[PDB]
Amino acid sequence: SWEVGCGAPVPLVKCDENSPYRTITGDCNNRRSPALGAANRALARWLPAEYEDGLALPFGWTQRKTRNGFRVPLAREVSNKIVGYLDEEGVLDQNRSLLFMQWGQIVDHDLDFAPETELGSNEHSKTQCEEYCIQGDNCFPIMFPKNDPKLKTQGKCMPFFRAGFVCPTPPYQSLAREQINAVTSFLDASLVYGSEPSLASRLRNLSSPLGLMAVNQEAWDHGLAYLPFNNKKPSPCEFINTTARVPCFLAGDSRASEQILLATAHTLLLREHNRLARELKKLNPHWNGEKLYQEARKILGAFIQIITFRDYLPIVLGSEMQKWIPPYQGYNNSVDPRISNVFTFAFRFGHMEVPSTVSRLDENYQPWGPEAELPLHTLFFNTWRIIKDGGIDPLVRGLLAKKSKLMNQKKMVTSELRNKLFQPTHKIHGFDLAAINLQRCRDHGMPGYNSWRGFCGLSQPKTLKGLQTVLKNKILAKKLMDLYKTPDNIDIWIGGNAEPMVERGRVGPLLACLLGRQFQQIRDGDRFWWENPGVFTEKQRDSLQKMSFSRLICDNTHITKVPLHAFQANNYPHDFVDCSTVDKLDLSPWASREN
């Protein structure tokens, strides 16, 4: 009997079996198991969770508890010795735009979010973790290795709180601890609309029956809309410049303001919505707010899906694309659509594609102002640079005309993220995304590198020399062996990202397999997948397949020169062309005459 009949949530809902629209929660997608791929349920386990005590405590928690007979190395030490680098010269991806990085993050945010356990409010224990670096309960601090410069300027640790888990909040116990996915597993634009009822209605333009999203009432971008602002005081976007006092945005997803390009992308998405909704009203004046909201939402859902599957995944997965994600063959209700706990680490390959600077560029795609280029760390939680420093258009052109960082075995994660990350409530630009990722693999009970190699039908190196051969890199294998002792102990995030990239792709074979399999399932196990006979008409679909990111820019900003292929590295003006040469979204097939 599954000791299923956990957990006390999620406020179970009931389905309208002939509803033509998705729920907000993702309930009801799968008819026979309606909670599948819904938000606020456990991330799926492709392999059993691996905890120090079998149930909940992470490897590394108890100093004298080994993993396979070896101590697991400090996350920050792995980070310092392997992940970091000094010289940003030469690190850029010659064939991927910055938008490639950015769309990766957007997709990730559509799919998964394992928020921290919520116990630190109404209490200092959260501030005591930071202050005293005392491991316990949900405080699992990232301690500095001796020799860390941060030890000299920053104290003993970086604070880190364990992720939320189902059943959920109070600690224990019986089966293994299962982390929660706070968003819908479907690729459904949940980051624009929200994955909870509360949030989803708050976001909409209810006053007006046009079914627009709520827009900003204090700022505009050459008349084009901005996201609404967020109420929650204290605001990290306020905190990073108290003079400017500009708060974070309010999106479907709580992380929308984390970095300025994410907030930028979110802005394009909310606008396409209204562009569609109003366009729909024009062509169907009879439809109330709802019908327009849902029809706009649904097209946008399709937009995310299409760009992701037609434009993005092929240039991540490369040669392995075919093998894991073959041409669509319809909805299959036996396929598990849930995001796996491992995927949420495999998709953090993006972290190695983030470059050290962001640019604002002008209509000639030239530096915009005298500080056109800024270090990435000054743009974390930064809304004021958008509203008071030229709106989104200069940033969007940066997205097209600048390049992603290329992953590099000797230059993995820029120090902007590896030393200068900001976390709300923690005041400093002093955190380490890489170390966090490693501690979080352990927090989540991740099987090690070789377990996952084995899952994917790949060899499992057991010696330094075997690891050299798999990684095609002597020195990197030697560093990982020195720290981890056995490849069986290499944390998945670093193991997966250390593999050389597959031909025509940007991740290695292990991640290709973890990624590919997840993406296959989110497409095949989705009853509302755009191409699934019945979701859209044949004519809508010849039209949906017209859509493009170049197009979404052209229709939602004052940029009129775009590339046809927005994810490749494009230089102005040679690889740019005017907006009128880029196919439009022909909405004719949405015309409804109910005469």
Ligand X SMILES: *[C@@H]1O[C@H](CO)[C@@H](O)[C@H](O)[C@H]1NC(C)=O
Ligand Y SMILES: *[C@@H]1O[C@H](CO)[C@@H](O[C@@H]2O[C@H](CO)[C@@H](O)[C@H](O)[C@H]2NC(C)=O)[C@H](O)[C@H]1NC(C)=O
Q: Does 532 bind ligand X (CB under 6 A)?
A: no
Q: Is 207 in the site for ligand X (CB under 6 A)?
A: yes
For residue 273, give the H/E element and its range.
Answer: helix 260-283
Question: DSSP class of residue 143?
Answer: E
Among the listed ranges 166-174, 192-200, 239-247, 359-367, the one in contact with ligand Y (CB under 6 A) is 239-247
For residue 532, give the nearest of 43, 39, 106, 186 by alpha carbon. 186
Task: List the single partner that 128 binds among ligand HEM, ligand X, Ca ion, none, CB under 5 to 8 Å by kind.
Answer: none
Residue 283 or 335: the one with the smaller Cβ distance to ligand X is 335
Residue 574 in marked binding region: no
- 72-131 residues near ligand HEM, rule: CB under 6 A: 101, 104-105, 108, 112-114
Helix axes 393-401, 98-111, angle to 10 degrees: 110
221 contacts 393 by C-beta, under 8 angstroms:
yes
The token pair at 451 is 């377990």
Going by C-alpha positions, the residue among 507, 514, 510 that lies closest to residue 487 is 510
- Active site annotation includes 109: yes
**Residue nearest to ligand X according to CB distances in the complex:** 208
Q: How far is the CB of 169 from Ca ion (least distance, A)?
A: 23
Count CB neighbours of 183 within 10 A: 29
Query: 258 a known binding residue?
Result: yes
Say how far apart CA 159 and CA 24 lie, in whole Å: 33
The residue among 103 and 144 lying less far from Ca ion, judged by its C-beta, is 103
Strands 92-97 and 403-405 come out as antiparallel
How far, in whole angstroms, is CA 299 from its chain's centroid?
21
Q: What are residue 143's DSSP bridge partners?
A: 157
Considering beta carbons, is residue 59 or 324 the nearer one to ligand X? Answer: 324
Backbone dihedral angles phi then psi of residue 92, each to the nearest 5 degrees: -80, 150
Q: Is 108 annotated as a binding residue?
A: yes
* Beta carbon nearer to ligand X, 93 or 258: 93
If one asks whether residue 244 binds ligand Y (CB under 6 A), the answer comes out as yes
Q: How far is the CB of 582 from Ca ion (least distance, A)?
A: 27
C-beta atoms surrounding 90 within 10 Å: 8
Rule CB under 5 A: choose which of 108, 188, 295, 488 binds Ca ion: 188
Minimum distance from residue 448 beta carbon to ligand HEM (Å):
18
Using CB under 6 A, which residues numbered 524 to 583 contact ligand HEM? none
Residue 555 annotated as binding site: no
Ligand-binding annotation for 23, yes or no, is: no
Rounded Cα gap, residues 324 and 329, in angstroms: 13
Q: Which is nearer to Ca ion, 190 or 414 (CB)?
A: 190
Residue corresponding to tokens 């006053």: 207
Among positions 15-44, residues that touch ligand HEM (CB under 6 A) are: none
Of 200 and 215, the one with the shorter C-beta distance to ligand X is: 215
Name which position in 348, 397, 453, 485 contacts ligand HEM (CB under 6 A): 348
What binding mask, one character per residue, do residues 329-368 give for ligand Y by CB under 6 A, x or -? ----------------------------------------
Residue 462 found at the interface with ligand Y (CB under 6 A): no
Asked if residues 28 and 184 have their Cβ atoms less than 8 Å apart, the reply is no
Triad 60, 64, 65: Cα angle to 5°? 55
Of 315, 374, 476, 577, the residue at the interface with ligand X (CB under 6 A) is 315
- In 155-235, which residue ranges form alpha helices assigned H by DSSP? 190-193, 197-202
Residues with Cβ within 8 Å of residue 132, at least 6 apart in sequence? none
Give the separation between CA 295 and CA 82, rounded to whole angstroms.
48
Q: Find the binding residues for ligand Y in span 388-447 (CB under 6 A).
A: 388
Does the annotation flag 351 for ligand binding? yes
Q: Is 188 annotated as a binding residue?
A: yes
Between 103 and 226, CB nearer to ligand Y: 226
Pick from ligand HEM, ligand X, ligand Y, none: which does 119 bind, CB < 5 to 8 A by kind? none
Name the active-site residue from 109, 266, 377, 444.
109
108 makes contact with Ca ion (CB under 5 A): no
Q: Is 440 in the site for ligand HEM (CB under 6 A)?
A: yes
Q: Does 590 bind ligand Y (CB under 6 A)?
A: no
Which residues make Cβ contacts (< 8 Å) with residue 590, sequence separation at least 6?
280, 283, 284, 295, 299, 540
Q: How far is the CB of 351 from ligand HEM (least distance, A)?
A: 5
Alpha-helical runs (H) found in 330-414: 343-346, 384-387, 393-401
CA atoms within 13 A on the CB side of 178: 23
For the chain, give percent helix, strand, coil, nearest 5: 40, 10, 50
Q: Which residues contact 498 (CB under 8 A, 6 or more apart)?
A: 82, 409, 471, 473, 476, 480, 490, 508
Alpha carbon 353 to its chain's center: 13
Q: Determine, following the binding rule CB under 6 A, whether residue 212 of this chain makes contact with ligand X.
A: yes
Q: How many residues bind ligand HEM (CB under 6 A)?
A: 21
115 is written with which tokens? 């928020």
Known binding-site residue numbers: 108, 110, 184, 186, 188, 190, 258, 351
Residues lying near Ca ion in the complex (CB under 5 A)? 110, 184, 186, 188, 190
Known binding-site residue numbers for Ca(2+): 110, 184, 186, 188, 190
Residues forming the active site: 109
Known binding-site residue numbers for heme b: 108, 258, 351
Residues lying near ligand HEM in the complex (CB under 6 A)? 101, 104-105, 108, 112-114, 258-259, 344, 347-348, 350-351, 353-354, 376, 380, 433, 436, 440
Residues lying near ligand Y in the complex (CB under 6 A)? 241, 243-244, 384, 388
